[PDB]
Each structure stands twice: as C-alpha cells, then as structure tokens.
Amino acid sequence: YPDYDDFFTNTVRETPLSSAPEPKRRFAPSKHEQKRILQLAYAIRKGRI
Amino acid sequence: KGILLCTNVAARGLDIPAVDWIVQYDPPDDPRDYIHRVGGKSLMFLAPSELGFLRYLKTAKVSLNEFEFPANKVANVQSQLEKLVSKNYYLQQSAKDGYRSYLQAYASYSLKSIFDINKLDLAKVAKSFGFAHPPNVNI
Amino acid sequence: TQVFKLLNKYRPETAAEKKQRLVAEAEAVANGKVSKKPYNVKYGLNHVVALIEAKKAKLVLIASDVDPIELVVFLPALCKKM
Amino acid sequence: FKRAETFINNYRQRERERIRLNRSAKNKGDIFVPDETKLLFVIRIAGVKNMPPKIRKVLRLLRLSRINNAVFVRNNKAVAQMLRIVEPYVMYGIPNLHSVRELIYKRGFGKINGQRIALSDNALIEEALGKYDVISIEDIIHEIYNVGSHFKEVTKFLWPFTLTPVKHSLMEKKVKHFNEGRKAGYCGEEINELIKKQV
Amino acid sequence: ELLGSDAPLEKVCSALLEYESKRKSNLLEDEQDDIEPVWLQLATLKFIGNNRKLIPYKIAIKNPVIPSSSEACLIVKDPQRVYKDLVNEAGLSKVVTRVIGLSKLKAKWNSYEQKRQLRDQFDIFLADDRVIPMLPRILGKTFYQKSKVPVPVKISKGTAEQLKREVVSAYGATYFNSAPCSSFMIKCGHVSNTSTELAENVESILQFVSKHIVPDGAKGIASIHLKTSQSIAIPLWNNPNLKELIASSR
Amino acid sequence: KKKGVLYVGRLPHGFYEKQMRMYFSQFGPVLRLRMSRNRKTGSSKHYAFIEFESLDVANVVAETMHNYLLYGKLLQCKVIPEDQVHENMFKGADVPFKRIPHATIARLQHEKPLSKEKADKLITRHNRKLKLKKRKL
RNA sequence: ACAAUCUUCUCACAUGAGGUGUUGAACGAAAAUUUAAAUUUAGUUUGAAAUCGAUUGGUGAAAAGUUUUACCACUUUGU
C-alpha cells in the first residue's frame, strides 16, 4: 500500500489536448434551434399550434 | 503620416521612405542582412531571454542605446483583447495562425544560441496574441 | 453552498422554458422579420471531459458517489493535469 | 445556532435603514399626503431584528407593536410623516365602506377593561362608549369611516387587527418566507383586495 | 478689480511662469506633452462648504486645462445603445472613447481592481447629470480620492448638437470639488499657457468663486496665492479691510 | 488556564465588534474584543483580535473559521501565541469608538463668539507673513 | 434569509438653486489656513490586500451618580 505516485500529473500541461480548429458552429446562432424555429413557424401558420 | 506592417522579406527589396520610426517587433530572421540594412529612429523589441543579441551587436561593432518604458503607462487592455479574440471567429483564426507561424519562424532562426525556442516561454507568447492558454500548435 | 449559489444562476433553461422561447421567435417569423451567446453550466461526462482537455473549464464539480466509480476516478487527476 | 452571515446581513440592513432615515429627514421634510380621503388603513407587513430605536417607537405609537397588526389612522400631516419614517415596514392604503364593515364585523376586538374582548354584542359597546353616543357596531363603523368627533376615542377602544397571511394553497404552505407577496409603500386602493383576501 | 478695487494680476502671473521656466532642473520611451499644472490657492474667512460636496464646479473658462486629446468615458442612464449611436452620429468617437450604461457600470465593475483598471483607462469621466448622485457609490475611494471625479455633463434631451456643445464645454471648463475647508486649491492652467491666458483664467475663476462659492462675496476672501506643484505660493492680493471684516464677523 | 488570543483578518464590512461577540460567544466566552480602526475617520481596518478564556477554545475557533468564504472574503483566523501577544493590543477593547468630527469642530472654532483681544491675537503677524515670502522672492 | 430602499433627477423663471453619498494600508511633494493637532490638498502602488500602535471634543435616549449604543455629530443616539 504505497502512497500515491503522481509521476505524470505533477506537472501542468500548458496547451489543450486537441489541435483541431474550432468549427463555426460555436460563433454563430445555433442551427438546431433555427431548424426548429422554422418547423414551429410552419406549425403556427397551418393552425396546428 | 501613417503606419504600415510588413515582414522583413516584404520590406527587403523595397526602398524605405522617410520614416519617423522603424520597429523590429519580431527578431530578424537574417541578422547578417539586418546589420547592414539598418544603415528617423531605430527601435527593436527584445525579450529578456534574448540578450545574447546584445553581445552579437557589440562583436559586430553596432552602436546602441537603452530604451526603457514605465510599466504603469502600458495599456492594460489584456482583458478586452482576450475578449475580442475568443469572441470573433475570424480574429481567433488569425490569432492562432499568427501564433503558429511566429513559433515556426522562431524554431527556424539561424541564431539558435541566441533565439532558442526552448528558452522561450509559450504561455507568455500566447498572452501577447490574446490567449489565456497557449493554443495547441505542433511546434 | 457558495458553489451552488453561483451554479443556480447558470442553470440550463427548462424544457418548457426553451420551447416557450422558441415558439416566441417562431411567431415573429410567422408574422415577418442577432441574439447573444447563452451562458449556463456545462454538464455531461463526455462533454465535461472534452472541456477539461480543451482547457476551457474554469471549475469542475465531481459527484462523490458515481455508481461505477471508475467513470469519475480519473477526473481528479485529469483536472489536476490540465 | 446563528452563522456569521446572518450577523453581517443584519448590520447591512441596519446601515440601510440609517441612510434611509437620514435622507428622509434631512432636506426632505415633505410628504405627498394623499387627498380626497381622511381614513387610511396601515398594516405592518415586515420586521427586522434589532430595529433602530426611532423606528421601534414610531411602530409603538402607531400601535403596530406586533407583525400583521392593522390600525385605522386619520389621514393628516402628523400620521403621514410618521408613516414616511416607517414606510418599509408598513403597507397602507385607502379602505372603503365594504372593507371597514367586514373588518369590524368579523375581526373587530374592543378594549374592555384592558383585555382583548370580541365585539359579539352591542351592550358592551354601549356600556363603554355611551358618553360619546356609541351604542352599536354600526355606530362604530359610521364613526370610523367618517372620522367623526369621537374618532380618536373609537380607535382607542378598538384593538389592532391581526391580518396574518392565509396559506390555503398547497403551494402557499410549502414555499418559504410566504407573506402573500405583501409589498411596502402606499398601495392606494389595492389594500381593499388585500383585506378581501383576509376578511 | 472686484478683489479689492484693484487688479494686481498679469505681472505676478507673467513672472511666475518665468521663475517656473528658470528652475528647469536613461532616456525613456513613453513620452507626453504633460506639463506642471498651475494651481490657485485661495484663503477665505470662513468654511465654504457645510459638508463635502461630490459634484465638481463647472468653472467655465476659454483656456482649457484638460488637453483636447484626453480620452473620455461617458456614463449615461440605461439604455446605452441609444447613447452609443448618438456619440457615433456626433462624431465624438475619437474624443468620447466609451459609453457605459449605469447598470452595466454597477455590475461589470465591482472589484476595486476593476475600478482602478477602468480609472486608468480613461482621462476624464463625463457622467449624465441625472445619474451623478449614484456615482459616489459604484466608484468609491478609488475614483473620488485618486483625482478622478466624474463631471456633470447634461445631455438630458439626447441630441447630437447638445452632445457636442456639452462635451466642448466640458473640456473648456475647469473643475473644483468643494469640501469643508478654509483654503482650497483650483487648477488654472499649465506652464505652457501664456501669461495673458492664465490671467484671464484667474480672473474668470475668481468671478465664479465669488459668485457661486463664497456666499458673502469678495469680502469673504482673505488672501490669494498662485502656485505650482513645487513652487512657492506667491501672493496676489490681500484683503485691505480684513481687520474690520473679521471684527464684524467674529 | 492560558487565555488564548485569536486574530481574524479579511473581515467583511459588517462583521463588526458586536457581530463577532455574539458569534464567537457561541464557541466560548469572550473576554476582550477589539477591531483596529483608523484614527482620523474611525472606519474599520478589516481585522480584529479576540481573547478567549482558554487557548484550547481559540484553537478550535481557528481550525473552524480559517478560510471561511464570507461575503466573498476568505476569513483569516490564526492563533497568536502568548510570547508575541503584547501588553496593550486590547487598549480600548469592548469600549465603543468615538467618531470625532474634526471637520465640524474646526468649523466651530473658525466661527465662534470671540472678543477684541483674541481678535488681536488673531490678526497678529500678517505683514511679516508676506515678508517671509518677500525674502524668498 | 450571504435577500432587503444609495436616489435612471427635482423646484423656480434658455436661466438659477438643490442631489450628501467614498474600503483599508503604504509612498510622497509643498502650500493655504485655523485653534503643538486640526481642516483642505499634488501625484503614485494595491486580490475588498490586513498580525498593537485608540483618537478622544461635544450631543442625549432609554434602564437603573451608574451601564448600553459600535457612523449620535452641531438639524448631534427613542414621534
């Protein structure tokens, strides 16, 4: 039962793990909500909602 | 009156007009070219970890003076600068590409003993680019 | 207590409150016709772990009694590593 | 037990009152003194631990020594300035004939020999107020709603009413710090609705 | 003339700029045209203010003390998008750097560190008149004691022309913060200012001080001195009837 | 036996001598409580000293409210040993502070009834007051 | 119950009067002043930072000369 040996986590990693670039999903209004807003818009004008 | 930003290579081969200030924001990739290219005011940004260039200029017989600045008067817009980069998609992609290119240029400097990427602190460099933490660039 | 006070100012909006907002904007376009980025708390094991590795998380709060404990056993180390 | 935050929270509240009292008194010796009425209904809605002594006395003078106490007051300059001093603790408005009638007819308690006695019969009223020509509950109602010559004596005889908030809904019973959403300040004619929810 | 039926001005001020230039006595990279400001010290026979008044006096003067290149922050009532559009319409972007709604000032600037960062970011803090009393709080000892007091600029009706006029008047006028004191210091100009300009500033400031500061008038003035940060408080004029004036008032 | 002394720092505005007394009395009896305050203004310096009847009770309080998140301020309660606990750190303890209004008392002595002799003792050396400036000219 | 009332403008005739509200510590210049300590006060540093350094003039409100106020300040502590 030795003590915890933090041979790897004893130093802080300065950079994010992944290098993939940010998609534009995260800087523009969401498309899922816009898709549902158009669907709800169709429902309103047809009298369903 | 005006201000222009250009690379060393783009300025190389062009005639320099009557300019009040010439600023070397990034180290010169061709110091042997820069020592004779310098011949109103000449100013150069240097990190405290690149003081070996001072010795090189002394060995190359280059006269120079010390420019000092008050840390109080430096604009503390680091918080606002961080806000703009993370908020604008195109500003961020420009910031990441510039950070990657600056590092890769730094790794390729001829004066390895003076401009050493290992002696460079990446957390500080990303801060100048508007990053809380260094982006993930493979060298 | 102080942690959850801040966390309860960033609760994700309810399923009814989200539909209430969406139908409000749906009516506007149904008549005739730009907003701000939503702020809330981030949840979900895979989502949070991806945020920690991205170094985007500012404060991670791990439940103390996750039933298969190995789901969260690496999180204190991963959080300290990043 | 009392945690450290509750002690600071009281101090911030006391400093909040001290600033308010100074600003209301200093350079603000004025009152908008509602008009077209002479009778006002004052209900003490909220109370703070360790009140400043000036607030404590004014509540004592207005006979609001306990929470949810309600008192009729003759609308004048003297009561208006006192109400402005104690504004955050009292909700007041203009009672109507209907509000005055049911409040007395269903929650009126008299001062008979100095104990709280329900006004079940007119014999006690005649005995204790025969010198001012007050014989009946209806006579009491007329005096209160018209602010007659014996209005002060009638109010002295009347106990302050106890309009405790009513929790009938299951949501009312469960939510914490329930006080029917009793706001402070001059509520105007809305106090008739608040009484209606009570009597 | 209003002082004591005489005006011993001009020669004293023309001289003091001359002594100021007489005591002239790394390379630094951050320079500026900042010069030592000219201070006017005034002694009265009584305490001017019953209490500290945290609203500066718009002492109008034709020679600005605030340099025209000073950055400005405008503090307006909510909403702030209305006022940001007006500033852009009036073309004050190079002058009025930022417009802050009061609620966004109360919330987004909470720490004393945030208050000091905002303080050093701008050179003058123009504030709408209707939200001046709120600024004592939200801006504590970090503003009202470290020589950064908001200015009461009146833009109530919200039009571009009155923005430009009030902004122009703002830099034109100097500012004094009345406190309970027998003597007070008022900025008149800088060493770069000429003798005639500073004398015009002094006489205009004295006119406003006699009118709206000293309730009993010029007779309540005891002595007048003009000074810089390091110079001597050179006297200008002394009361010729102070013996009987204090005797009646005592 | 040994009366313990406890130092509390980073006091939130409002955690004043009264509030600490009814609070720490729940831990144990208090003997001398003093919040250090400024001279000219009387405003709090945001730290204070508590003397408990025992040093054991002071240890418990220190272990209890050290790094206490109170109104956004981490409370700093550390036990001061006896040897650097000094003689008069409790001068004025449990005695309400006096907010002397130096500004107004200056106003009153500026504007008070006064006679001709003291008026002469006022007007005094006006002429040579300029002359000390004249010699500097 | 770590929640509360620090004002998002007034009054008078484009004009005048008013708004009473500021964390602490440290560095620091030379001036006007008043009756040695006291009022204003340049210009700077700061995680809402802290390890003795408290000054002591006046005003009265309740319990019973006495003790209790923890911004009672000169409009001076309970209409």
Numbering used by the authors:
A (entry chain m): 199 to 247
B (entry chain D): 387 to 425, 435 to 534
C (entry chain G): 88 to 120, 125 to 173
D (entry chain t): 51 to 249
E (entry chain K): 5 to 29, 41 to 265
F (entry chain o): 102 to 238
Show passages lifted from the paper.
To understand the molecular basis of the defects in 60S biogenesis caused by the absence of Fkbp39, we tagged endogenous Ytm1 and analyzed whole-cell lysates or isolated (Ytm1 pull-down) nascent 60S fractions from wild-type and fkbp39Δ cells. We analyzed the isolated Ytm1-containing nascent 60S by cryo-EM, which revealed 3 major states in both wild-type and fkbp39Δ cells—each state can be further classified into multiple substates. Among other differences, the RNA domain III is flexible in state 1 but stably incorporated in state 2. Notably, these 3 states look nearly identical in wild-type and mutant cells, but their distribution differed markedly. In wild-type cells, ~20% of particles are in state 1 and 50% in state 2, and in fkbp39Δ cells, the populations are ~65% and 15%, respectively. The accumulation of state 1 particles in fkbp39Δ cells indicates that Fkbp39 is required for a step in 60S biogenesis along the transition from state 1 to state 2. The defects in 60S biogenesis in fkbp39Δ cells occur at multiple steps and indicate an overall delay in the assembly process, in agreement with the reduction in 60S subunits in the mutant. We did not observe misincorporated ribosomal proteins or biogenesis factors among nascent 60S particles in fkbp39Δ cells.
